[PDB]
Design a protein around this ligand. Structure first.
Ligand SMILES: Nc1ncnc2c1ncn2[C@@H]1O[C@H](COP(=O)(O)OP(=O)(O)OP(O)(O)=S)[C@@H](O)[C@H]1O
Ligand SMILES: Nc1ncnc2c1ncn2[C@@H]1O[C@H](COP(=O)(O)OP(=O)(O)OP(O)(O)=S)[C@@H](O)[C@H]1O
Ligand SMILES: Nc1ncnc2c1ncn2[C@@H]1O[C@H](COP(=O)(O)OP(=O)(O)OP(O)(O)=S)[C@@H](O)[C@H]1O
Ligand SMILES: Nc1nc2c(ncn2[C@@H]2O[C@H](COP(=O)(O)OP(=O)(O)O)[C@@H](O)[C@H]2O)c(=O)[nH]1
Ligand SMILES: [Mg+2]
Ligand SMILES: [Mg+2]
Ligand SMILES: [Mg+2]
Lengths: 330, 318, 258, 354, 344
DNA sequence: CCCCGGGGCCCCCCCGGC
DNA sequence: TTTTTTCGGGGGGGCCCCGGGG
């Protein structure tokens, strides 16, 4: 904990103010409007991993209370005990008592509330209803099916979308400026493609790419560096494998798959996922082809998830694709 | 800003039984009980945000007048309601001597009683029977099945139903006139449609829309309240072509940040409540959905699994 | 044993100080500097703030080269302090960039040495200035009477209401089984100036506090024979126990009046 | 006296009489036992895997390995449930069967084995090389029955404390063993003895016990009926000798187990009658078999192979039967209530036959 | 009791099994994981090690890599106080994660000694290593999410697994992912040859390559096979070279003649003959997985079968392998597979 | 120096979806 | 016309033993 430069990039680049949260303009604008006019309701933030929920709520707490927000809000997460007794005693005491420092309202942040038991959620209902005049609740979740309907009825919901491309590009530009790094356009495209809308993945991969350069001061990060550090297949490899499967005999396809995998030690799961993404754009005459492709590839993925024999699984992928595409003729 | 605006669900909480919309017969019966007296042991069950707690509190207030503080004992899930509590505190309250008007009794309001343990409910039986001459019990719950049969036998069952769109519109218009809210017919229609009979949700959504955009129209309402994903799932499952279902899955659910577990659970529920389709077909689809749900629970929460589930459902429906 | 060396001539004083607020907070940062030791902690419910100060007059010897922050779990510290006899001097020892604190109990008469080490913890707490406020009312009364009143009233209700009016202090509790009210008036006896009750009022006040927090606070009565209560509307209530060199302060937030 | 299967069990590597190549490999392993890795012996049941393991232990340490005692160990679960474990111990090795604790087998791995692993040997057990033995051997019987969590717990225990203990596991099949465990063990195949070797062993027992034999063909028939199981062949020889006043004739019939006869009767009934009432009676028979400690997997295998030996069935029926047997054997592997899967298999077979 | 004097670490290691004896001791002894080892080495000077998720197939060098990294980072003396290792052999319930892991993560880093600061980098944080993290329950994993982020300034987490899908999505998001590749004759031959030379093992040309092919991505299995072959050669005491046939015999690979007989029986198509042959075959104790792998190799690579036959047999083999992976009866599954192939 | 009140563990018993 | 498995949470009965009072 010497300096901020000894931290992982995911934590080192955590937004400190609402102005640094990207890709959530609608939610940020709405919550800022609520806070400015003192019309903050009970909030629920539902979204996938690494979209800015915790960052946004902490930034909102800073906006409301200032630099000393930590002593003016009650933050509980999955790493803490949040049983029914905790709800009855600690949350109830915090919600029904005035602030020690200031004279403002009180904020309770139940991060990862989807991990809370049903009994505690039920106990929270009357606590929320009874102390609304002076207390507000913020719930954060990735899975809404774990939240009781009663709790959902009492909260205003905001959905955090997967981060758009433009927000990721702007944050990457900021990180490159801070770190004195060069990123090629194709490298940025590949990084955004592999991120799948998660900023944490982008930051971790960028840190690994920087660590992979011999001389980061002048060396530039190319798509080759990204693929090498992440150990992911290149688009050319996927295209070649798919072409061999769809246009060559069994021996040639098997040899091509083995050679492509052994060239860089690729994983079969990555090849399957990339081929599925490519095939999703194909215009197929017969629906049976798509049905068989999806079912067989899902079965192969599930089997791979439990281990098994890699060679048999690869041959199964080849055979499944060939058999499914055999239906396009008639 | 350290100020807080009082929520309209609290600012406009009904204070008398006359201000409660919906369930006309039940509210009329409660009004008659309040006017006459001799309140019996009662259990009120219904769905969230329809006016059960409001009804019970209004009844108690109008029945007991100035003696509300001394003659009402309110316990909810946020309080301790164990066997010791039932055996000591509730029993003491029942045995308490309190002079009341000729036809009034002390009231114990056990809100969210469906969360009480079996032992406490068993202990309540003799307390209710012995001191019925001075104390009466009111239960409010979401699931009446959770109340043990011996308690149900001693109580009067007053079941509440979902509020119709007319009652919701009436209450919303009253609140709008009180608050001077600019609105349009499409906005109110969208609010009512998204509320789904939950008055608290409708009022909260209206207040949020007014705070965020001012004008309550369809555009702002949808900007605040998202389209219910169960309806999107229902559209996905009833699509004619597998391509359309896959497109819906990829664009309206997967790219909107909905988790695979949520999607599969919603699909299971929607298929269960899909009366338009034959029961056997629904059972086959439920089997496939269960297979996919187990796979997701094992950790394979990918879009390919959901696509395969949709393909298998399409094959079944062919 | 180079940077920080602070010797309590009596090892029981530090044990009493820790016991005064060990049931209120668990993780505490002790800041030691040339003019003594300070500490501030906030309860988990964030309703009570504990502030301890010990000057250099409270140590037989005290040496601190540079300011040092020691994060401790009060349960472990109390466990360690319970292993020392009442007739042994207690030396606190810490070095540069410390990961531990050394507690050394010495009995020169018996030539007995007992050295314990307690691992430090990383606590991200910044000392929050307790800005001085001109309180409406300020009173002082013997700690034993306040403890007795609090304990008696806690049996009836979980909330105790304190009303300060001209020439009168009233503690009221209302509960399921009944109610209670204790009324005291400022009284001075020159013969024994330790049972006196002193009050200075500028604006009458009425504030309700949780009974459990008052029960925790009254545990500091073992440190001082008197307790000073400062109350003012729209501000936390201050309960101060004065030590020989320093003090122990509790800031308790009142309950919302609604 | 002791049964002939036990009285004539070899006690040394040089006393083994079948699978000479395996004997040579084991002798090579025991030549320099200081760096011996963990061993996993896999093979058909009743072949001599435990006998060979004990012989290898005797070669490494000495005859004292056969001085076996039985102790009892206590275990406590998270719910304060007291469990007893029977441990077979020797001055040089321990024997444990964690499957006796069922789902609690993990505890035995987490506490007992670990406790032995952490304890360094301080007994001056001088070896052939002149230096005292350094490690203590632990045998895990029925290792294929261990739960996946116990196998996972075994991994770092094997890796970290290899200098203090060495594991010898014995299994009928390696299919239930997780890949990390197989990676950590030296795998040793134990082939079943040939018919000639079984006949030689049986003739040796006969001449040692002074049993009248009309011809040597009876021993060959016994070996053939045993299907390569030496324990079964020896026990069958003893049973036949007892049933014929220690005088075996060329017409003496092969004695079959009671459960085998019940399964054959069930197969005949299934082939003859295919209806719901027949299914109910089959359920009754299955319950009777299961109540008396007949494993479900054994029942399924025996039923499948008995059905496949029926002469009235055609190729399609047999193919369907084997497919259903595979599916329902997987179901049994992934299930709890065995009767459910057995009834499903019988119903599917009944449908296919019609 | 006579008692035995304590044995030095060097001689103790010299008498260990080859897998433990030749475990990498520093980051330079890891053979074919440069894409991650280079990044980990760069962290030695950057001193900003992130949370790590090592995932890969068995015996690829994950535990060795983490141990070597911790040693290189801290030194033999400071390593113990800076490391908290929990594996599948320890209780790791939600209570443990909430209390013990959190308490260790919140602790101040142990003060390095003067010698340690002169020699080793000694970064200002400790490391928690959750080996076999895929065995932890979902709730226990969820309990780590905010603990990882809150105390990143003094603690870094390393999770090691074989099946990445068993790690919940939030944790995988929080961790920088390192995939460990399978070790084959093209990337691990140098290490195996070095081990063979250090042990003076005499092998024919291609024997080590054959061992690595048989191991199928697991270097631990290859080293164990090499040690077994060396022991056999030493016991024989003839001075001859190890051969591929001996390696196959030690590895349980079915002889080619038996495979040809099985293939001919399948080609015949007679159910009874196949059943009798399989009954005789299962008495040899051959592992069903090896038989299925060899059948796959024989059939997929054979040029005498058409596309449709290969398409069907690939799915048949995949189904049989999946069923075997669940711990099923080998005899029944093998017979079913052979019959189904015979009916193609 | 001995008895009584009340905090803290220890042990066991039942649920788990909409 | 009768009666089973596992974690985790919650509840509830039972002591145990420190502290404080007499
Ligand atoms: N909108 C964002 N803008 C900039 N950085 C982001 C954003 N979202 C996530 N990040 C980055 O990823 C890190 C984690 O962001 P979080 O706010 O913790 O996401 P999260 O949605 O709360 O994750 P979960 O739900 O606990 S898995 C931040 O410190 C940022 O570095
Ligand atoms: N029939 C109603 N008439 C007017 N307002 C209502 C009505 N029902 C609900 N509301 C409003 O929504 C708020 C909450 O109503 P509640 O009585 O708490 O619903 P509920 O049935 O108790 O919900 P649950 O079962 O405890 S989740 C009230 O303060 C009212 O402002
Ligand atoms: N990359 C490698 N370089 C050198 N030796 C290796 C390598 N990988 C495995 N080994 C050897 O095999 C032995 C075991 O390696 P491990 O690090 O334990 O593999 P692992 O990935 O941790 O196994 P799992 O995932 O727990 S089954 C090492 O002691 C080495 O002798
Ligand atoms: N004469 C002789 N009998 C053997 C031999 N191997 C095994 N047996 C006999 O076969 C019996 C069963 O062998 P067992 O070790 O239980 O096989 P396992 O079930 O695979 O462990 C033993 O009681 C021995 O008597 C051998 O090599 N020679
Ligand atoms: Mg978060
Ligand atoms: Mg309610
Ligand atoms: Mg490992």
């Amino acid at each position: 904990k010497r300096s901020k430069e000894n931290l992982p990039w995911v934590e080192k680049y955590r937004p400190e103010t609402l102005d640094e949260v990207y890709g959530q303009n609608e939610v940020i604008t709405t919550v800022r409007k609520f806070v400015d006019e003192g019309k903050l309701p009970h909030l629920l933030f539902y979204g996938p991993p690494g979209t800015g929920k915790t960052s946004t709520i902490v930034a909102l707490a800073r906006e409301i209370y200032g630099k000393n927000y930590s002593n003016m809000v009650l933050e509980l997460n999955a790493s803490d005990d949040r049983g029914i007794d905790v709800v009855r005693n600690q949350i109830k005491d915090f919600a029904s008592t005035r602030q020690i420092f200031s004279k403002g309202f009180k904020l309770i942040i139940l991060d990862e509330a989807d991990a809370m038991t049903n009994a505690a959620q039920n106990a929270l209902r009357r606590v929320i209803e009874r102390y609304t005049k002076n207390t507000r609740f913020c719930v954060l979740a990735n899975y809404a099916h774990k939240l009781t309907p009663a709790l959902l009825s009492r909260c205003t919901r905001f959905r955090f979308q997967p981060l758009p491309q433009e927000a990721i590009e702007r944050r990457i530009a900021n990180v490159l400026v801070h770190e004195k790094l060069k990123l090629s356009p194709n490298a940025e495209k590949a990084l955004i493609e592999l991120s799948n809308g998660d900023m944490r993945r982008v930051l971790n991969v960028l840190q690994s790419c920087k660590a992979t350069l011999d001389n980061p001061d002048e060396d530039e990060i190319s798509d080759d560096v990204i693929y090498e550090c992440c150990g992911a297949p290149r688009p050319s490899d996927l295209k070649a494998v798919l072409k061999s499967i769809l246009e060559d005999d069994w021996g040639t396809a098997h040899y091509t798959l083995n050679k492509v995998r052994s060239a860089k030690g690729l994983a079969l799961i990555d090849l399957i996922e990339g081929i599925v993404k490519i095939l999703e754009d194909y215009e197929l005459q017969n629906e049976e082809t798509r049905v068989h492709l999806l079912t067989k590839l899902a079965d192969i993925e599930y089997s791979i998830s439990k281990g098994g024999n890699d060679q048999i699984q690869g041959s199964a992928v080849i055979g499944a694709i060939k058999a499914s595409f055999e239906n396009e003729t008639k | 800003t350290l100020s807080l605006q009082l929520p309209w669900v609290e600012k406009y909480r009904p204070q008398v039984l006359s201000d409660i919309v919906g369930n006309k017969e039940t509210i009329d019966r409660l009004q008659q009980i309040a006017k006459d007296g001799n309140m019996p042991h009662m259990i009120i069950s219904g769905m969230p945000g329809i006016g059960k707690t409001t009804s019970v509190h209004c009844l108690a207030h109008e029945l007991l007048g100035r003696s509300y503080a001394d003659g009402v004992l309110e316990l909810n899930a946020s309080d301790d309601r164990g066997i010791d509590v039932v055996r000591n505190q509730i029993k003491h309250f029942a045995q308490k001597k309190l002079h009341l008007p000729p036809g009034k009794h002390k009231i114990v309001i056990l809100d969210e009683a469906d969360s009480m343990t079996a032992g406490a409910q068993q202990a309540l039986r003799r307390t209710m029977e012995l001191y019925s001459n001075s104390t009466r019990f009111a239960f409010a719950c979401n699931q009446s099945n959770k109340i043990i049969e011996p308690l149900q036998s001693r109580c009067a069952i007053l079941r509440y139903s979902k509020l119709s769109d007319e009652d919701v519109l009436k209450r919303l218009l009253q609140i709008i006139k009180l608050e001077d809210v600019k609105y349009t017919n499409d906005g109110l229609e969208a609010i009512i449609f998204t509320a789904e009979g939950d008055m608290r949700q409708a009022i909260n959504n209206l207040q949020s829309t007014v705070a965020g955009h001012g004008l309550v129209n369809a555009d702002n309402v949808f900007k605040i309240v998202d389209s219910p994903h169960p309806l999107i799932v229902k559209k996905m499952l009833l699509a004619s072509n597998l391509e359309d279902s896959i497109q819906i899955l990829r664009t309206d659910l997967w790219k909107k940040g909905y988790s695979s577990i949520d999607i599969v659970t919603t699909s299971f529920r929607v298929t269960k409540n899909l009366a338009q389709v034959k029961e056997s077909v629904r059972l086959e689809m439920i089997k496939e959905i269960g297979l996919t749900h187990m796979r997701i629970l094992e950790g394979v929460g990918t879009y390919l699994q959901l696509a395969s589930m949709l393909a298998k459902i399409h094959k079944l429906n062919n | 044993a180079s940077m920080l060396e602070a010797k309590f001539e009596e090892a029981s004083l530090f044990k009493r100080i820790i016991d005064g607020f060990k049931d209120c907070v668990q993780l505490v940062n002790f800041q030691c500097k040339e003019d003594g030791i300070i500490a501030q902690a906030v309860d988990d419910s964030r309703v009570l703030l504990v502030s301890l100060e010990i000057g250099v007059e409270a140590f037989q010897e005290y040496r601190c080269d540079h300011p040092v922050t020691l994060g401790m779990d009060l349960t472990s510290l109390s466990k360690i302090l319970r292993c020392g006899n009442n007739t042994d001097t207690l030396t606190l020892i810490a070095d540069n960039t410390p990961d531990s604190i050394i507690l050394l109990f010495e009995d020169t008469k018996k030539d007995r040495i007992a050295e314990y080490s307690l691992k430090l913890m990383d606590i991200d707490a910044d000392f929050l200035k307790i800005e001085e406020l001109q309180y409406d009312s300020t009173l002082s009364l013997p700690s034993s009477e306040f403890s007795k009143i609090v304990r008696d009233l806690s049996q009836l209700s979980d909330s105790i209401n304190i009303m300060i009016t001209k020439e009168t202090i009233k503690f009221v509790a209302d509960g399921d089984i009944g109610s209670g009210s204790v009324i005291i008036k400022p009284f001075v006896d020159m013969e024994h100036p330790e049972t006196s009750i002193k009050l200075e009022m500028d604006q009458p006040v009425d504030l309700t506090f949780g009974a459990k927090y008052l029960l925790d606070i009254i545990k500091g009565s073992s440190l001082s024979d008197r307790v000073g209560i400062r109350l003012s509307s729209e501000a936390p209530a201050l309960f101060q126990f004065d030590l020989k060199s320093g003090f122990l302060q509790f800031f308790l937030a009142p309950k919302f009046n609604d | 006296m002791s049964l002939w299967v036990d009285k004539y069990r070899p006690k040394s590597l040089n006393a083994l009489s079948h699978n000479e190549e395996l004997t040579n490999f084991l002798k090579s392993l025991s030549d320099q036992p200081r760096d011996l890795p963990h061993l996993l012996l896999y093979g058909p049941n009743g072949t001599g895997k435990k006998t060979r393991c004990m012989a290898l232990l005797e070669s490494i340490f000495g005859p004292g390995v056969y001085r076996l005692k039985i102790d009892v160990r206590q275990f406590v679960t998270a719910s304060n449930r007291k469990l007893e474990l029977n441990v077979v111990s020797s001055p040089y090795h321990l024997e444990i069967t964690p499957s006796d604790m069922g789902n609690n087998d993990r505890i035995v791995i987490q506490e007992l084995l670990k406790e032995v692993a952490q304890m360094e040997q301080v007994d001056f057990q001088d070896s052939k090389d002149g230096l005292a033995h350094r490690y203590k051997c632990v045998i895990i019987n029925e290792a294929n029955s261990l739960t996946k969590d116990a196998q996972a717990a075994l991994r770092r225990t094997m890796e970290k404390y290899s200098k203090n203990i060495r594991l010898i596991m014995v299994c009928d099949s390696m299919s239930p063993i997780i890949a990390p465990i197989k990676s950590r063990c030296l795998l040793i195949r134990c082939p079943a003895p040939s018919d000639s070797e079984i006949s030689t062993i049986l003739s040796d027992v006969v001449t040692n016990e002074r049993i009248q034999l009309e011809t040597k063909d009876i021993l060959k028939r016994i070996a053939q009926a045993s299907n390569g199981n030496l324990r079964v062949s020896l026990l069958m020889l003893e049973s036949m000798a007892l049933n014929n006043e220690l005088a075996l004739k060329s017409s003496s019939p092969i004695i079959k187990p009671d459960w085998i006869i019940v399964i054959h009767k069930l197969t005949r009934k299934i082939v003859k009658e295919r209806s719901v009432n027949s299914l109910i009676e089959c359920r009754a028979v299955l319950y009777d078999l299961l109540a008396h400690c007949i494993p479900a997997n054994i029942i399924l295998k025996e039923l499948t192979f008995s059905l496949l030996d029926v002469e009235t069935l055609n190729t399609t029926n047999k193919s369907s039967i084997i497919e259903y047997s595979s599916v329902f054997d997987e179901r049994l592997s992934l299930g709890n209530k065995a009767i459910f899967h057995l009834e499903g298999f019988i119903a599917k077979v009944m449908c296919c036959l019609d | 009791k006579r008692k035995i004097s304590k044995l030095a670490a060097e001689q103790s290691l010299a008498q260990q099994p080859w897998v433990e004896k030749y475990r990498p001791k520093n980051l330079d002894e890891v053979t074919a994981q440069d894409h991650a080892v280079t990044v980990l080495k760069k962290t030695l000077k950057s001193a900003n090690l992130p949370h790590m998720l090592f995932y890969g197939p068995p015996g690829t060098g994950k535990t060795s890599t983490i141990l070597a990294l911790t040693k290189e980072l801290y030194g033999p003396d400071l390593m113990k106080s800076r490391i908290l290792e929990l594996n599948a052999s320890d209780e790791r319930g939600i209570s443990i994660v909430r209390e013990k892991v959190k308490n260790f993560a919140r602790l101040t880093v142990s003060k390095p000694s003067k010698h340690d600061l002169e020699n080793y980098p000694c970064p200002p944080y400790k490391i928690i290593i959750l080996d076999e993290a895929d065995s932890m329950t979902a709730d226990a994993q969820s309990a780590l999410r905010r603990t990882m982020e809150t105390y990143s300034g003094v603690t870094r987490f390393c999770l090691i697994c074989n099946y990445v899908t068993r790690i919940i999505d939030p944790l995988a998001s929080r961790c920088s992912k390192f995939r460990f590749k399978a070790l084959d004759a093209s990337n691990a031959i140098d290490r195996l040859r070095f081990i063979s030379e250090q042990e003076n093992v005499k092998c024919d040309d291609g024997v080590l390559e054959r061992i690595l092919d048989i191991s199928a991505g697991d270097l631990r299995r290859g080293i164990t096979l090499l040690q077994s072959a060396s022991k056999g050669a030493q016991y024989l005491g003839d001075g001859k070279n190890i051969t591929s046939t001996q390696v196959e015999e030690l590895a349980g690979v079915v002889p080619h003649d038996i495979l040809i007989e099985i293939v001919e029986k399948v080609k015949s198509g007679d159910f009874d003959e196949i059943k009798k042959y399989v009954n005789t075959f299962m008495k040899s104790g051959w592992s069903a997985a090896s038989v299925v792998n060899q059948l796959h190799e024989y059939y997929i690579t054979n040029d005498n079968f058409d596309t449709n036959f290969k398409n069907q047999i690939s799915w048949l083999l995949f189904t049989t392998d999946s069923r075997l992976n669940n711990g099923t009866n080998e005899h029944i599954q093998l017979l079913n597979l052979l019959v189904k192939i015979s009916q193609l």
